Design a protein around this motif. Structure first.
Motif, PDB file in Angstrom:
ATOM      1  N   UNK A   1       0.806  -1.762  -0.057  1.00 33.36           N
ATOM      2  CA  UNK A   1       0.340   0.196   0.060  1.00 33.36           C
ATOM      3  C   UNK A   1       0.812   1.116  -0.084  1.00 33.36           C
ATOM      4  N   UNK A   2       1.766   1.639   0.625  1.00 35.27           N
ATOM      5  CA  UNK A   2       2.863   2.260   1.004  1.00 35.27           C
ATOM      6  C   UNK A   2       3.647   2.627  -0.307  1.00 35.27           C
ATOM      7  N   UNK A   3       4.144   1.959  -1.034  1.00 39.42           N
ATOM      8  CA  UNK A   3       4.153   2.436  -2.567  1.00 39.42           C
ATOM      9  C   UNK A   3       3.669   3.653  -3.515  1.00 39.42           C
ATOM     10  N   UNK A   4       1.901   2.616  -3.444  1.00 38.83           N
ATOM     11  CA  UNK A   4       1.032   3.550  -3.469  1.00 38.83           C
ATOM     12  C   UNK A   4       1.287   5.294  -3.531  1.00 38.83           C
ATOM     13  N   UNK A   5       1.048   4.890  -2.192  1.00 35.53           N
ATOM     14  CA  UNK A   5       1.202   6.707  -1.619  1.00 35.53           C
ATOM     15  C   UNK A   5       2.140   7.451  -1.640  1.00 35.53           C
ATOM     16  N   UNK A   6       3.570   7.401  -1.672  1.00 34.10           N
ATOM     17  CA  UNK A   6       4.225   7.355  -1.652  1.00 34.10           C
ATOM     18  C   UNK A   6       4.818   7.853  -2.854  1.00 34.10           C
ATOM     19  N   UNK A   7       3.901   7.287  -4.292  1.00 34.53           N
ATOM     20  CA  UNK A   7       4.811   7.082  -5.064  1.00 34.53           C
ATOM     21  C   UNK A   7       4.041   8.707  -6.222  1.00 34.53           C
ATOM     22  N   UNK A   8       3.099   9.728  -5.300  1.00 38.25           N
ATOM     23  CA  UNK A   8       2.323  10.623  -6.047  1.00 38.25           C
ATOM     24  C   UNK A   8       3.317  11.899  -5.047  1.00 38.25           C
ATOM     25  N   UNK A   9       3.839  11.618  -3.791  1.00 37.37           N
ATOM     26  CA  UNK A   9       5.099  12.544  -3.272  1.00 37.37           C
ATOM     27  C   UNK A   9       5.780  12.205  -3.632  1.00 37.37           C
ATOM     28  N   UNK A  10       6.382  11.695  -4.009  1.00 38.54           N
ATOM     29  CA  UNK A  10       8.041  11.481  -5.025  1.00 38.54           C
ATOM     30  C   UNK A  10       7.552  10.603  -5.817  1.00 38.54           C
ATOM     31  N   UNK A  11       7.381  11.344  -7.250  1.00 37.25           N
ATOM     32  CA  UNK A  11       7.429  11.231  -9.108  1.00 37.25           C
ATOM     33  C   UNK A  11       8.216  12.262  -9.790  1.00 37.25           C
ATOM     34  N   UNK A  12       8.465  12.604 -10.830  1.00 35.80           N
ATOM     35  CA  UNK A  12       9.432  13.526 -11.947  1.00 35.80           C
ATOM     36  C   UNK A  12       8.010  14.614 -11.999  1.00 35.80           C
ATOM     37  N   UNK A  13       8.186  15.351 -11.310  1.00 36.99           N
ATOM     38  CA  UNK A  13       7.195  16.466 -10.423  1.00 36.99           C
ATOM     39  C   UNK A  13       7.599  17.620 -12.056  1.00 36.99           C
ATOM     40  N   UNK A  14       7.241  17.298 -12.878  1.00 36.87           N
ATOM     41  CA  UNK A  14       7.027  19.058 -14.012  1.00 36.87           C
ATOM     42  C   UNK A  14       5.272  19.440 -15.122  1.00 36.87           C
ATOM     43  N   UNK A  15       5.162  19.819 -14.904  1.00 40.33           N
ATOM     44  CA  UNK A  15       4.476  20.439 -15.645  1.00 40.33           C
ATOM     45  C   UNK A  15       3.568  20.425 -17.036  1.00 40.33           C
ATOM     46  N   UNK A  16       2.598  19.855 -17.348  1.00 44.51           N
ATOM     47  CA  UNK A  16       1.712  19.262 -18.384  1.00 44.51           C
ATOM     48  C   UNK A  16       1.289  20.311 -19.632  1.00 44.51           C
ATOM     49  N   UNK A  17       1.383  20.318 -20.628  1.00 41.68           N
ATOM     50  CA  UNK A  17       0.230  21.464 -21.179  1.00 41.68           C
ATOM     51  C   UNK A  17       0.671  21.270 -23.240  1.00 41.68           C
ATOM     52  N   UNK A  18       1.731  21.786 -22.974  1.00 37.60           N
ATOM     53  CA  UNK A  18       2.335  21.145 -24.508  1.00 37.60           C
ATOM     54  C   UNK A  18       1.866  22.908 -24.760  1.00 37.60           C
TER      55      UNK A  18
END
Length: 91
Positions: A74-91
């Motif tokens: 369960x924790x890998x799923x929770x943490x995945x959001x706070x711990x990912x490659x954070x960049x903006x998406x629009x194009x």
């Protein structure tokens, strides 16, 4: 904007999580009813077969799981959001 430290708890079901954001007070809300003014990423965690709810207060979160459910999955799923490659998406 991430998990700095998984803080201790006397209850294995819901555990408190120190964020990087602190003081004054962020959104003080129990994320449970789906679309609790939180991003789809946090809604995905709610939909993960293992999470009961995600409480948030001032700085620290308190993610409640289900009774049988294991943070080992369960924790890998929770943490995945706070711990990912954070960049903006629009194009």
């Amino acid at each position: 904007m991430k998990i700095i430290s998984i803080s201790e708890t006397p209850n294995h079901n819901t555990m408190k999580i120190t964020l990087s954001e602190s003081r004054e007070g962020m959104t003080s809300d129990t994320y449970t009813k789906v679309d609790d003014s939180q991003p789809a990423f946090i809604n995905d965690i709610l939909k993960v077969e293992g999470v009961k709810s995600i409480f948030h207060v001032m700085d620290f979160i308190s993610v409640d799981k289900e009774n049988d459910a294991n943070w080992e999955t369960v924790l890998p799923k929770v943490e995945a959001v706070f711990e990912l490659e954070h960049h903006h998406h629009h194009h």
